[PDB]
Amino acid sequence: MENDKGQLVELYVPRKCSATNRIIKADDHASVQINVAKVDEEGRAIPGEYVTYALSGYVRSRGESDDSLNRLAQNDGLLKNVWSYSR
Amino acid sequence: GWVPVTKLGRLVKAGKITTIEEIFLHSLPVKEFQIIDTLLPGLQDEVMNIKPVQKQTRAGQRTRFKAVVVVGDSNGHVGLGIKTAKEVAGAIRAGIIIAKLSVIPIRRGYWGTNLGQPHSLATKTTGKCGSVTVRLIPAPRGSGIVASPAVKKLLQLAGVEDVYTQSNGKTRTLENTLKAAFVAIGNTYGFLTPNLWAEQPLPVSPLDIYSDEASA
Amino acid sequence: GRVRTKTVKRASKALIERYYPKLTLDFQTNKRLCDEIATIQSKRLRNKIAGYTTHLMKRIQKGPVRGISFKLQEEERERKDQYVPEVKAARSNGVLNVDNQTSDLVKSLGLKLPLSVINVS
Amino acid sequence: TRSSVLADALNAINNAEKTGKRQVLIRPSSKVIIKFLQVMQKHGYIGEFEYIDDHRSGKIVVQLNGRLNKCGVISPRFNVKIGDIEKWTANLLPARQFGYVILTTSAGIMDHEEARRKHVSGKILGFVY
Amino acid sequence: RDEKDPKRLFEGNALIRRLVRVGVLSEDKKKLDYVLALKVEDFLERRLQTQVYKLGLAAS
Amino acid sequence: SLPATFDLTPEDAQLLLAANTHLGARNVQVHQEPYVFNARPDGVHVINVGKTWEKLVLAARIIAAIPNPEDVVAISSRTFGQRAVLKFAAHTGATPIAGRFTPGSFTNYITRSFKEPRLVIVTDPRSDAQAIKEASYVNIPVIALTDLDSPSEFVDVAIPCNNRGKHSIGLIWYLLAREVLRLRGALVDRTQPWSIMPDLYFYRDP
RNA sequence: UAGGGGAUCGAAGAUGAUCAGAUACCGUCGUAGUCUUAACCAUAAACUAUGCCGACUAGGGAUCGGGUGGUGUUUUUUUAAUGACCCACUCGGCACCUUACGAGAAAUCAAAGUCUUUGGGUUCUGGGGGGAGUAUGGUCGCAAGGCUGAAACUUAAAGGA
């Protein structure tokens, strides 16, 4: 959203569930945003650096999330198995 | 004194947080109220309806005096609450707060002709409570604030300036009416138009960014 | 009756927290003491606080009574906590028992099983 | 019966998407529909979509984004004159900007803003936002 | 209409110049657009009633 | 992850033939388990006898997911158990929770023995009905230890055995762990035995 | 309405009880009717007191009917086979829980939502309370009766939660 001359004219841009590209509308509570993590090449938790992702309320209600992430950090680049795009 | 409570309170006293748009981004809660006192001062109150009830005792009829209160400024910020109480002087009062935790953005914007300086909504919205249905619709320039005395009121405080309206919808219910209308503007933001799709990429939560101040 | 009261309990139950140690059951040695500590109204009230207390230290000893702990009972729970030694190591029946259908995934998953298992109700 | 096709599948697509299905399956395949999606797609509202044939009137998978807000079929299929669409947009499009009403001419199983650059109009089947 | 169509421009550029002649809206605002942000109160200053007042030749 | 000997060695048909874990049940085969070798003409389901080393030791990397095993528990409320799950809590990680489970303990900020896990487990999914539900909630993976008998919706993997009396409830977790530990921990790599008995492991008093 | 059937219940009728009265309640018998063939009538709180088509919104966990997939549960017979089963998924039901972003006079409602931001398609109905669904005509029926449907007069409330 913007003017004639490149002036972002808004309150903000809404944040949008990360697997579901709906919206997160202010006063959700249900509302999470994850901060997993990465290892460094060693049993050491990497600090000040992490992943992210972002759950609606939407799906907390429906069982969903557990299987929605178990798509995504396997789908990203950390996890191996559990999950299948071919059930 | 203020004083504080929770991780969220402490922060804003100190002033590690600045604007209300932090708080709707990460979409926090809010329990304390001063949390938007320090921030938005612009804020002004307004009393819509002071009605008696009643819960009817063994040789009498008890009464309170629902008030219902609306708050905000001009810029995309409405507040709304409904605290019965007994005597007016809790009843308004700790209405005024009831509304303040319920501050809610809006997402003034364009009719068409982009031009320069928002006057109307972005899009069509609807709301529903029990009976009332509100169909807010974006109107071109100073067309006007097309509605009942009260709706006008809400919608002024929330500038916004111009927009067609319509009801259904028993709107001798001043209370179920506002309930509703409110739940629509609070829902401009809860509607994907092309101009959002450009994926924004998550900041980092206050709840562990100033983790230490946030506690003893 | 004979049925105790808040003001009283909740005055002994606050007390019993700090002063378990001066602490007793000869209640006539608490009575005196229970003034140097609380800042009580009355003489009657005071004689009904300590009555209750002695109904704590006469059952405390007998055992773990409820929703009250005073840095002395809570350190006998980091002392009673812990235990069984050796931890789980089978030799005696070595091979550790592994349903006999417990060989497929973990033939499709590791390194060394010293396992126990049901050749087929 | 099934008395009408496009409708049936469309409705399920605003009842997949609501729940957050990432997709869909829909039965009776048409040309009509193939064309319909091919409009939607150009405009950024779905992707890919992987006909399947079975020698029959046939089945079609439509992979998601989670953008779709809403795509009702209109439905007699009324008639329409050029300067008339100017009544529709604002009776079923949230804005103007945006979000395409959509219609069927001669070219064209093609929206209205492209219609200007063509200057044509006939009957108006679905609409997107 | 679109923008650019014969009717829209002509009136606009005829519409507008009728209001430039009456002082109502400025030069600098006339795109079209914009005439909409004209409230009652602008017209009133261009009533003779008051333009006299401002040209003082009048106590109040 | 195909390795080497986690593979059966010289004794994995000898030691569960005196304990029964290939066995199923009476007139009962629950649509919800590959987890029944046929099914005989005289009585009874000869649980498939090769695929519990398939979803009782998913069940050991999934964790390997603990950085800190006392979260790695054992879920229960039986009699023959309170002497294997209490006990899965001792020799490694975990609050035992047999007897009191502690309802909530995973719904709801208001209780006592406080939970906020990421893969819990669960003896009898007829006795342990609240890792299937206290999970169909919000974000708490589960793992039922799925006899011919275990509603399978939402305990997403299989863990089959036999519980019609006797031993193998407790004496079966034992295998979840040993082989979870031989990914990560402190024991040792074909064999140099394993210093208990499966005949410590049984009762404490009737 | 005319034949058949006429166990049991059981208006009507008779009764004995109770009762100031009791033509009612309570009890025992009881034509007619309940049942059926063949022909009428068309009303009901015919009730979700919620027109149907559609299209879109927010979570669940059940179930009936299908269908798809899982070296899925037993069946054991030798492995299968099916079948019951489990679970995964779905489309179509018949409902239910929970929220309230909405709606409402509220009670409550996934529809009574998308309605003063007032408009997807169309058929019926109501406009104070009675008088009265009567009097009248007109009509369907053998009759009971239905559908149609006034006005004069009267009245400041009748009503909903």
Which stretches of B55-198 are assigned E, i.e. beta strand? 69-72, 78-81
Count of alpha carbons within 13 Å of B110, Cβ hemisphere only?
19
Task: Tell me if F39 is assigned to some domain.
Answer: yes
Strand partners, F149: F147
Give the structural domain span for D6: 1-68
**Rounded-to-integer distance, Cα C113 and Cα F182, Å:** 9
Q: Cβ contact (<8 Å) for A63 and F67?
A: no
The residues, ordered by sequence, that sit 6+ positions from F24 with a Cβ below 8 Å of its Cβ are C121, F36, F44, F45, F47, F147, F148, F162
Domains, in order of start, for chain B:
7-105 (3.30.160.20), 108-196 (3.30.230.10)
Residue D78 and residue D94 share a domain:
yes
**Rounded-to-integer distance, Cα B165 and Cα B171, Å:** 13
Q: Are B100 and B32 in contact (CB under 8 A)?
A: no
Q: Cβ contact (<8 Å) for A66 and F58?
A: no
Domain harbouring A27, CATH code: 3.30.1230.20
Gap from F149 CA to chain C (nearest CA, Å): 14
Q: Is residue D94 less than 8 Å (CB to CB) from chain B?
A: yes
Structure tokens at D4: 């009408």
Residue D48 and residue D87 share a domain:
no
Between the two ends of chain F, the Cα-to-Cα distance in Å is 42
**Rounded-to-integer distance, Cα B86 and Cα B107, Å:** 37
Task: Tell me if F151 is assigned to some domain.
Answer: yes
Dihedral of CA B75/B81/B86/B87: which sign?
A: positive
Query: What is the CB neighbour count within 10 angstroms for residue D4?
Result: 10
Residues of A with CB under 8 A from a CB of D: 17, 19-22, 58-59, 64
Q: Cβ contact (<8 Å) for D95 and B191?
A: no
Buried residues in F177-205 as b, exposed as e (16+ CB within 10 A): bbbbbbeeeeeeeeeeebebebebbeeee
Residue D78 and residue D30 share a domain:
no
Q: Is C67 helix (H, G, I), strand (E, B) or coil?
A: coil
Q: Name the nearest CA neighbour of F158 among F170, F145, F168, F148.
A: F145
Give the structural domain span for A78: 1-87
Query: What is the CB neighbour count within 10 angstroms for residue B117?
Result: 11
Q: Is E8 helix (H, G, I), strand (E, B) or coil?
A: helix
Task: Tell me if F5 is assigned to some domain.
Answer: no
Using CA coordinates, name the residue in chain E closest to B143: E36
Sheet containing B44-47: order of strands: B44-47, B69-72, B78-81
Residues in chain F: 206
What amino acid occupies position F94?
A: A
Residue D18 and residue D5 share a domain:
yes
Q: Cβ contact (<8 Å) for A66 and F141?
A: yes
Among D68, D96, D113, the domain boundary falls at D68
Buried residues in B29-50 as b, exposed as e (16+ CB within 10 A): ebebbbbbeebbeebeebebee
**Inter-chain CB pairs, B–D, below 8 Å:** 27
The residues, ordered by sequence, that sit 6+ positions from D21 with a Cβ below 8 Å of its Cβ are D64
Pairing of strands B78-81, B44-47: unpaired
- Which residue out of F179, F197, F199 would a mutagenesis test of the C interface target, given it has the greatest number of C Cβ atoms within 10 Å? F179
Number of domains in chain A: 1
Nucleotide nearest to B128 (CA to C1'): G102
Task: Tell me if F7 is assigned to some domain.
Answer: no
Residue D123 and residue D92 share a domain:
yes
Q: Name the nearest CA neighbour of B199 among A76, A16, A6.
A: A16
Residue in the block written with tokens 């001792």: F90
Number of domains in chain D: 2
**Rounded-to-integer distance, Cα E29 and Cα E20, Å:** 10
Q: Are D16 and D68 in contact (CB under 8 A)?
A: no
Give the nearest partner residue to F12 out of C88, C95, C121, using CB atoms: C95
Give the structural domain span for F157: 12-206
Gap from A1 CA to chain B (nearest CA, Å): 6
Strand partners, D104: D109
The 8-class DSSP code of residue B34 comes to: G
Between the two ends of chain C, the Cα-to-Cα distance in Å is 64
**Inter-chain CB pairs, C–F, below 8 Å:** 214
**Rounded-to-integer distance, Cα D124 and Cα D91, Å:** 14
**Rounded-to-integer distance, Cα C14 and Cα B216, Å:** 25
The residues, ordered by sequence, that sit 6+ positions from A28 with a Cβ below 8 Å of its Cβ are A56, A57, B27
The DSSP annotation for D49-105 comes to -----------------TT-----------------GGGTTT---S---------B-
Give the nearest partner residue to D65 out of A21, A59, A64, using CB atoms: A21
What amino acid occupies position B178?
A: L
Rounded-to-5 percentages of helix, strand, coil across chain C:
15, 0, 85
